[PDB]
Amino acid sequence: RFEVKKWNAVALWAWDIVVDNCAICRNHIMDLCIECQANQASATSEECTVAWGVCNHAFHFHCISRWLKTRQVCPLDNREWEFQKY
């Protein structure tokens, strides 16, 4: 018989606007890109990861990389985009 006295837990918070999936492409964030999954395996498919921003928004690295070639704004909030994690 053991009794619990005190508990110290750690939690992380993320935006719930998107249901655990990319916003630019309608795919699960742990899966591959549309272009990556459509194309044959290559060096580009090796470097497919998840990129976070200062606004705590999560997209595929390739998705936001393609989005940034024309616009300099996060898709979900109108502020400028800055990479902070991979």
Partner: protein, 501 residues
């Protein structure tokens, strides 16, 4: 003979000033210096090596004073001193053996003692000459980034990792300022600063989450030193975590004042809510919450959903700890354990014998993690039954005793350290590739058409303050950028690239 030569030179100066003409002074001094010094430089160099071998600072200072009169006579001394310092550093590192591969204190103290000794020698005897300082700097930079320890690890990135681990050991739970300053002096000679930055950030996050720091003043001083040495983005990244800690403290206070106007909870509850993009932690494995803890879970989830609308919380159960108090034993013991341990002890709350397969089904923990935590429990004499199988029988051991009422069982598992080190090294390599790609893209955006060698030179110039890139990696990044439709090879004029919109 050195003292004899100095005395003779003084006597000659006295003679020429007292009973000769003024026009003879320069020529007589030149001839005397020639005859007395320049003809014995071969002997002087061997004596210099011998005096360096057996520490004799006064003789070295006298010889520096003597040879400084001869034009271009100090170069050989500088080269010999640089070689001697390099050899001494290599020998000092080599004598520590294999133990220095997993002992940051020994490695850093050896380097620091060598540097202190030869800095003192340069300042005291050579009058802080620029060339001798440069020789000491080159020798230190040569033997810090390549030595016996780095050969064992087959990578020059072991030194920054050891330095960061030494800093973490220093800052964990008056003379600390001096050793921090000395460490920052060592940091200047390191070429792979990104490895140090990554390791320091990870260990600072671990320190902040678990609340084990010697003092906040030491952390502030180290942050100030990093401001002075590193850039401005890194310190901002650290300040983000420092701000999240305060936000979590305020939220804890608000939750505590909220619990008064409701039914109080049985246990003492504290939480650290952190942003998912500013901390190095990953998602936890599958885990079924113990039956005594859903109350706090639901209450805090409701409170957070009330105060913040569009956010969702993910719970890291591998970084959570707590207290278990036991009463069905010889005497009243209170023990500190992780959430996994608390879950896998309270499974047999009234039972006495389980099969690890049943324990796996009840706790929903994977194979390796459960095996490691069970081994840790068994080694603690708290539980009794080396290899384990799914049909192994493990039973609670009654009547165990310890010399102290307060016992902790949250000892780290051996494999996690090595796995974490490998993971962060791989992450560092991937980040290096990404920054090289970004630099190439930006340079091509600025200059529409540029050659190969100029591109490489500008890339190394831009990335020099963090690490020294390898040219094959730059070619690989260029090739992967060509495929991704970022830049294209122009027809004709081979080995030339142009930016493509």
């Amino acid at each position: 003979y050195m003292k004899k030569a100095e005395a003779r030179l003084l006597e000659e100066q006295r003679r020429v000033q007292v009973y000769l003409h003024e026009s003879t002074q320069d020529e007589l001094a030149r001839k005397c210096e020639q005859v007395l010094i320049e003809k014995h430089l071969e002997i002087f160099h061997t004596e210099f090596q011998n005096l360096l071998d057996a520490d004799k600072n006064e003789d070295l200072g006298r010889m520096y004073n003597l040879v400084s009169r001869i034009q271009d006579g100090l170069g050989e001394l500088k080269k010999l001193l640089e070689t001697h310092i390099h050899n001494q550093g290599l020998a000092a590192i080599e004598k520590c053996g294999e133990a220095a591969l997993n002992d940051p204190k020994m490695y850093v103290q050896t380097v620091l003692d060598v540097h202190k000794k030869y800095n003192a020698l340069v300042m005291s005897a050579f009058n802080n000459d620029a060339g001798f300082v440069a020789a000491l700097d080159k020798a230190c930079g040569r033997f810090i980034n390549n030595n016996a320890v780095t050969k064992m690890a087959q990578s020059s990135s072991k030194s920054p990792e050891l330095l960061a681990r030494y800093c973490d050991s220093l800052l964990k739970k008056a003379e600390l300022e001096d050793t921090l300053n000395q460490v920052m002096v060592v940091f200047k000679y390191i070429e792979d600063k990104d490895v140090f930055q990554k390791f320091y950030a990870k260990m600072l996050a671990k320190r902040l989450v678990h609340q084990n720091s010697a003092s906040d003043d030491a952390e502030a001083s180290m942050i100030s030193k990093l401001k002075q040495a590193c850039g401005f983005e890194y310190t901002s990244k650290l300040q983000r975590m420092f701000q999240d800690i305060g936000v979590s403290k305020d939220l804890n206070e608000q939750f505590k004042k909220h619990l008064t106007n409701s039914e109080p909870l049985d246990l003492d509850f504290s939480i650290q809510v952190l942003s998912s993009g500013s901390w190095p932690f990953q998602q936890s494995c599958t885990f079924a919450l113990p039956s005594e803890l859903e109350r706090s879970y639901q209450r805090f989830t409701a409170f957070y959903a009330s105060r913040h609308s569009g956010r969702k919380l993910t719970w890291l159960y591998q970084l959570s700890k707590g207290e278990l108090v036991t009463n069905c034993f010889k005497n009243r013991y209170t023990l500190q354990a992780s959430t996994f341990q608390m879950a896998i002890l309270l499974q047999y709350n009234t039972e006495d014998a389980y099969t690890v397969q049943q324990l796996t089904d009840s706790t929903q923990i994977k194979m390796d993690i459960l095996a490691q935590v069970l081994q840790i429990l068994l080694k603690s004499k708290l539980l009794v039954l080396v290899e384990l199988k799914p049909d192994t029988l493990i039973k609670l051991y009654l009547g165990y005793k310890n010399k102290k009422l307060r016992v902790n069982i949250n000892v780290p598992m051996k494999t996690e350290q090595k796995q974490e080190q490998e993971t962060t090294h791989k992450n560092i390599e991937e980040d290096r590739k990404l920054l090289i790609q970004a630099a190439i893209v930006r340079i091509m955006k600025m200059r529409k058409v540029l050659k190969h060698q100029q591109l490489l030179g500008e890339v190394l110039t831009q990335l020099s303050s963090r690490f020294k890139p390898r040219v094959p990696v730059i070619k690989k990044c260029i090739d992967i950028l060509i495929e991704k439709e970022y830049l294209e090879r122009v027809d004709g004029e081979k080995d030339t690239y142009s930016y493509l919109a």
